[PDB]
Every structure is written in structure tokens, then in C-alpha cells.
Amino acid sequence: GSSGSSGEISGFGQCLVWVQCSFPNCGKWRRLCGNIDPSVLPDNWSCDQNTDVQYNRCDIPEETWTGLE
């Protein structure tokens, strides 16, 4: 594990946002670019409203759990 230090000039300090589909059967958390907020986003947002083509559908599965042992 590693602590995400916030202040070091070295390293990527980009943010990360997640949006949950509006449909119940979905309820999946899609990944957006990074300059998007839920406050400005619509209430009926869905996977089809995703920026990542890799996960811009309601049929695409959620990002599998990653993590080295």
C-alpha cells in the first residue's frame, strides 16, 4: 500500500470521479475523464452518458477489483 501524498511536485496528482448509473439493474459506477462533477451532472445520468467508450454502455461490466498481493 501507499499513501497518496498531496503536495509533492513529483508524481501524478490528477483527481478521480465516479458516477453511478440511474437504472437499478445497472447501479454500476462508471469512470469519467476527471473534470466532471455530480453536482453539475444530471439526475437521470446513465452509462450511455459516459466519456470512456470502454464503459459507456449499460451492458459493460464494472471495473474488476485490482490489487497486487
- Taking the C-alpha atoms of residue 43 and residue 28, their distance in angstroms, rounded to an integer, is 15
Is 15 assigned to a binding site?
no
Residue 37 CB, nearest approach to Zn ion (Å): 19
Residue among 17, 20, 26, 31 that touches Zn ion (CB under 5 A): 26
Residue 20 CB, nearest approach to Zn ion (Å): 9
Residues that constitute the known binding site for Zn(2+): 21, 26, 47, 58
Note the residues at the interface with Zn ion (CB under 5 A): 21, 23, 26, 46-47, 58
